[PDB]
Amino acid sequence: MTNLQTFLDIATEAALAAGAVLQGYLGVTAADKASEAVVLEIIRRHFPQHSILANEYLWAIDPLDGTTNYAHQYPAFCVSIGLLINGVPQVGVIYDPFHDELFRGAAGLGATRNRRPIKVSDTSELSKSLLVTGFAYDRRETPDNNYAEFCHLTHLTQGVRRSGSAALDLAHVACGRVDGYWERGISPWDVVAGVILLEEAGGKVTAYDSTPLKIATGRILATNGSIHDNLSRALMQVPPLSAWE
Amino acid sequence: MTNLQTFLDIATEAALAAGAVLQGYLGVTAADKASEAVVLEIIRRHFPQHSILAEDNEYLWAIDPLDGTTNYAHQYPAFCVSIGLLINGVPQVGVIYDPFHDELFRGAAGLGATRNRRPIKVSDTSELSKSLLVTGFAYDRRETPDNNYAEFCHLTHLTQGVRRSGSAALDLAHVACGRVDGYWERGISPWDVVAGVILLEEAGGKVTAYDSTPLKIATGRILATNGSIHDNLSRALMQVPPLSAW
Amino acid sequence: TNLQTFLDIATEAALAAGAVLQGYLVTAADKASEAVVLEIIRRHFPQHSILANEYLWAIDPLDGTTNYAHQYPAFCVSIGLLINGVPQVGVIYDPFHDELFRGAAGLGATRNRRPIKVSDTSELSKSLLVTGFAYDRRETPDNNYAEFCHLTHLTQGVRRSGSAALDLAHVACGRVDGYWERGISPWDVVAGVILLEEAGGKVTAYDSTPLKIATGRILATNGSIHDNLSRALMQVPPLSAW
Amino acid sequence: TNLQTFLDIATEAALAAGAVLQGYLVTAADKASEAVVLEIIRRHFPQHSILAEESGKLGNQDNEYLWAIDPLDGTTNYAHQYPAFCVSIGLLINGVPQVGVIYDPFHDELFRGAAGLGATRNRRPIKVSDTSELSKSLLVTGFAYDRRETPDNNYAEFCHLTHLTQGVRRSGSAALDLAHVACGRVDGYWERGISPWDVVAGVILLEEAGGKVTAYDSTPLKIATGRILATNGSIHDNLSRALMQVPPLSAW
Numbered sequence: 001m002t003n004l005q006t007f008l009d010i011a012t013e014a015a016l017a018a019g020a021v022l023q024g025y026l027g028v029t030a031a032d033k034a035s036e037a038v039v040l041e042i043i044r045r046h047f048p049q050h051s052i053l054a055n056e057y058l059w060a061i062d063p064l065d066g067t068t069n070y071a072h073q074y075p076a077f078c079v080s081i082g083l084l085i086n087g088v089p090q091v092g093v094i095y096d097p098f099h100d101e102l103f104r105g106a107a108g109l110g111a112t113r114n115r116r117p118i119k120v121s122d123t124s125e126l127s128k129s130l131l132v133t134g135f136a137y138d139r140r141e142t143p144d145n146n147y148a149e150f151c152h153l154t155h156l157t158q159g160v161r162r163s164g165s166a167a168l169d170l171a172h173v174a175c176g177r178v179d180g181y182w183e184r185g186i187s188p189w190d191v192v193a194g195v196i197l198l199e200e201a202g203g204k205v206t207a208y209d210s211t212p213l214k215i216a217t218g219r220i221l222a223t224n225g226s227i228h229d230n231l232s233r234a235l236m237q238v239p240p241l242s243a244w245e
Numbered sequence: 246m247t248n249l250q251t252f253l254d255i256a257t258e259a260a261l262a263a264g265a266v267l268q269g270y271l272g273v274t275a276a277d278k279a280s281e282a283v284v285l286e287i288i289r290r291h292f293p294q295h296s297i298l299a300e301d302n303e304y305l306w307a308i309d310p311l312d313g314t315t316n317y318a319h320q321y322p323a324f325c326v327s328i329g330l331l332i333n334g335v336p337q338v339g340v341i342y343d344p345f346h347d348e349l350f351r352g353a354a355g356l357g358a359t360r361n362r363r364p365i366k367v368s369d370t371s372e373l374s375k376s377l378l379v380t381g382f383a384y385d386r387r388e389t390p391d392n393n394y395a396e397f398c399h400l401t402h403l404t405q406g407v408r409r410s411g412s413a414a415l416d417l418a419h420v421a422c423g424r425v426d427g428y429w430e431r432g433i434s435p436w437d438v439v440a441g442v443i444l445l446e447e448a449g450g451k452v453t454a455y456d457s458t459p460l461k462i463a464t465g466r467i468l469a470t471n472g473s474i475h476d477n478l479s480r481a482l483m484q485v486p487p488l489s490a491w
Numbered sequence: 492t493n494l495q496t497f498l499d500i501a502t503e504a505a506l507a508a509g510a511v512l513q514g515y516l517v518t519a520a521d522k523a524s525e526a527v528v529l530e531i532i533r534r535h536f537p538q539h540s541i542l543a544n545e546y547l548w549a550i551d552p553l554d555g556t557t558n559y560a561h562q563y564p565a566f567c568v569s570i571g572l573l574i575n576g577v578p579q580v581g582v583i584y585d586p587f588h589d590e591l592f593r594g595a596a597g598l599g600a601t602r603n604r605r606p607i608k609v610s611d612t613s614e615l616s617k618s619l620l621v622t623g624f625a626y627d628r629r630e631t632p633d634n635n636y637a638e639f640c641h642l643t644h645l646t647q648g649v650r651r652s653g654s655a656a657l658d659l660a661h662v663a664c665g666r667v668d669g670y671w672e673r674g675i676s677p678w679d680v681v682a683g684v685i686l687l688e689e690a691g692g693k694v695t696a697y698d699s700t701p702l703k704i705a706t707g708r709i710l711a712t713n714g715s716i717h718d719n720l721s722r723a724l725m726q727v728p729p730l731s732a733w
Numbered sequence: 734t735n736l737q738t739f740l741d742i743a744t745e746a747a748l749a750a751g752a753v754l755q756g757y758l759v760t761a762a763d764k765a766s767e768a769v770v771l772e773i774i775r776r777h778f779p780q781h782s783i784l785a786e787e788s789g790k791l792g793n794q795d796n797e798y799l800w801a802i803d804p805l806d807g808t809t810n811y812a813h814q815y816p817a818f819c820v821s822i823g824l825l826i827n828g829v830p831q832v833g834v835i836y837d838p839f840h841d842e843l844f845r846g847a848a849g850l851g852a853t854r855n856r857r858p859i860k861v862s863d864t865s866e867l868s869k870s871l872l873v874t875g876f877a878y879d880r881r882e883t884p885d886n887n888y889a890e891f892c893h894l895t896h897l898t899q900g901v902r903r904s905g906s907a908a909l910d911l912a913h914v915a916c917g918r919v920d921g922y923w924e925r926g927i928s929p930w931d932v933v934a935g936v937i938l939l940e941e942a943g944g945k946v947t948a949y950d951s952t953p954l955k956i957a958t959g960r961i962l963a964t965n966g967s968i969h970d971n972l973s974r975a976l977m978q979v980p981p982l983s984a985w
Binding site (some may be wrong): 072074121130146147157160161172176178179241242 | 320408443
C-alpha cells in the first residue's frame, strides 16, 4: 500500500545517511552513537507518532551491526532499519556502507539490492548447501553455545560461514549467497529488517523446530524455504559436543 | 632487487587479467579453467624458463586461478586469484586479487606490502581476548578426528570471535592488512597460501607451523599472525581440549 | 526542518530515478525516470505543484539527453524545489559516476554526503569555465559563440560537458570557477542554483543584476571571479570582429 | 604475444602511475607519475627509447622502439580537479603507433589496445559508433596554448561544427577524447597543436576499435604537424569535408 512505500522511502534515506556517518569514522562507540543519532532524527522527523523499539508502528534500529568487525575494520558491518507493524516485520533496509550494498524490502513490494531484484536460492539438499551462523556474547556462560550446531552442519554441508553480522547474514540468504542461516542470542534490531527482506525474496523464517518465529527467544532459523525442513531437522537432531572424539 | 619487482609486475597483470575473466563469468569449472589459462599464458610468455605448480626449478609459480570455489559457486563474496612465486622453495612474490570487491594485494621480499597500491601493515593486538581470528575446515574433515572443530571452539571461547570466510588466500590478506589478528588452518595446499605468506611477512607478520617451528607447507598446516599474538595463539592451539571434553 | 524533509524525499527520488536511467543505459528512459520521480513527490507531498503556488518542483528526469543517447558520461537527474519562486532545495544525481549533489537553504551543500565548497580562484586568467549552446543556435546570431571565443582567450579554457545541471554542480564543488549559458530552462538550473549558493557561490544575470530564470540566461560562479566574468560578458566582441 | 608483452607492461605502468596521481589529487604529481612510468618501462625494456615532454628525449629518437609518454594529460583539469585527466602510454614501432594504454584514475577507466590484439575498456571489448550522418553526430575538440598568437586558433572550426552536428564537447584531455571515440561515446575528434605523447596511445586504440585517424584533409596522419582527425570511420569523409570548408569567423 501507499504508506509502506513511504515507510520504505524514509528508511532507505536514513540508512544511507547513517552509512555515510559510519564511513566517515573509518579514517567505534562514537561512530555507533553518531549513526544512531542520524537515524533517530530522520525517523522521528518524518514519523513523530511512531515508536522506537524499547505503537502500531515500531522501528527496530541497529545503527552499527557488526561492532566487533567494525572495531577491526573487518568488512562485514551495516546499518539495519526495520519496521514492526503490530509486532510483525513489514519494512526492512540493510546497508553495507563499506561495499555499498543497499538491501531493501517491504511487504508486497519486493526485495532488492542496489534497487535491482534479488531472490533466494533453490538449493534443497544440505550436502550441496552453504550456510552461515554466529555465536552469542553469552557463549561462555551456557552449554548451549551453538558450537555443536556449527560442527554438525559443517559436517553435513559444503560449509558454514561466520561473517560477524547477523543483519548481513540475513541479507545474504535473501539474495542467495547462502542457503540458510541460524543463530541464538540475537536481538530484534539484529533481525527485523532482514526477516521481511528475506520473506519478500522468497525465503522462510521460523524457530529452529519450524514452529513460528519468536524473536523474544533470541533464536532464528532463516532459509531459502526449500532447505528449511532439512536444516530444521538437522538442528533439532544435533549431537552434543561430548559425542565427538 | 630488480628481479623481484619485475616478477611482481607480471604477477600483478596476470592476477588482474584473470580477475576480469572471473568477473565475466559471474554475469564454475569453466570459470576456473579460463582463469588458469589466462594466468599460465602470461607467466609463460614473460618467463618461459620458469616452472608452474597449480591444480625443483629455482623459480616455481604456485597459482590458484580461483580460491574460494565453494563461495564462487554460491556467489558468496569471498573469492580471489592467488599468484605466488617460490624461489628455491621459499615464497618471495605474492599477488592476491579479489575481483568482486576490487582489492589488489601485492607483496614481494624487501619491497613491502600494499592493498590497491597503498601500504598495509599487520595489527598490534597481543591478547587473545581482544583479538579477531579466522580459520577454515578441510575437504577431508569427515574422515579424520583432526577436523579443526576443537580449535575453532576453543579459540571462539578465548577471543572476540573466529571468522570463516571460505578463502584461505583472502584470510592471509586480511591478516596482512590488520582486519584480523591471526589465521590458522590445516589441510591447505601450496597454491592457497604461497602468495599470502610473503604478503603477510612483508606486512610485518609471522608464519609458522602451529607449534612455531618453521612453516612446512607440505604438511598442509599454517599459523599466520600479526606476530605480536603469535606466541599466545600458538600455545592455545597446542593445548586445545578435545571436543569430547565439552 | 521543512527543508530537510523536502531534501530527504528529493534525494530518494533522484536515486530511484537514477537507477532507472542506469538500467536503460532514450525516450523510454526519460519517461521512465520522470514517472519514478513524479510518483515519489506526489505521494509524499500531494499538495505541491510540478514543473517538468507556494511549492513548485522543477524536475529534469534526464538532463543531458544528447549525451545519454551517445552514452557520453555527463547526464543526471535534477530535482529542485521553488518556494514562492525561489530555489530552496536541490538534488542533482549523476548515476553513471554515482555522484550525488545535495543542497538546501541554510543546510549546506554536499557531494556523496560530504561537504563541498566553491573554488578560491580570483583571476579570470587562471580560471576554468564551462558553457553550453542552445537548440535554437542556428536561428539567432546571439548563439553564444562569440562569448565562447572571448572567454577561451581570457581564461585557462572553457569546457563543454553537455549537461547544465552538472555544470552548476561542478561550480558548486570547485571543479570549475564559473558557468554561463543562454537558452536554458528552469528545470535545468533550479537545483543547481541553490546547490551553488549553499556551496558559497553566486548566481545572477550576465550583467550581475538578479537572476531571471525566465530569460533563459544564467551566470554562476564561485563568487570571486563573478565581477570579472560579468565584465567580460558585457564586453564581448562579435564574431565578425575576429 | 610480441605486442602483448609490450601491452602488459604499459598497462602496469599506467595503473601504477594512476595510483600516484590519485594519491596526490600538481607539479610534483606530474613529476611523480613520470618517474613511476619511466622506471617500469626502462626496467622491462632497457633498449627502448622514450619520448616525453618533461624528461625530453631518452635514447636515439630513430630507435625502432619509441615510447610516447604523457604522465598527466589534462594538466589544467587536474589542477582544478576537473574529472578529465589520464596517463597516456603509447609505443611507436618504426614511428607507427602500435601499443596504447590510457588510464583515467578518477573514474577508473582503463583503455587498452595493440595492433591485431583489439581494443578494450576495463578489459572488455569496445568499438566505435555507427553514426553515419554529421547532423546526428557528437564531436569533441580542443584549443591549443598558442591560440592567442595565431588566427588559426580552431574557433572557426568549433563554430562551424557546432552548427552542423548535435554538439561539440570540450573535455580538456586529448587522450581521453581519443578513448571516447574508441568506445563510441563521441563520433569524432579533431584538434591542432597536439603533441605525440597526447595521441600515440589513443591512435592505435581507436584504430583497433574500428576507427580512422588522418590529417584534416584525409591524407595520412602526420603527428609532427600537430593536427589530427579521428573518427568512427563512417563520418570521416563528412567531417573532413567540413574541415576543408570552414568559414572564417569574420564571415559570421
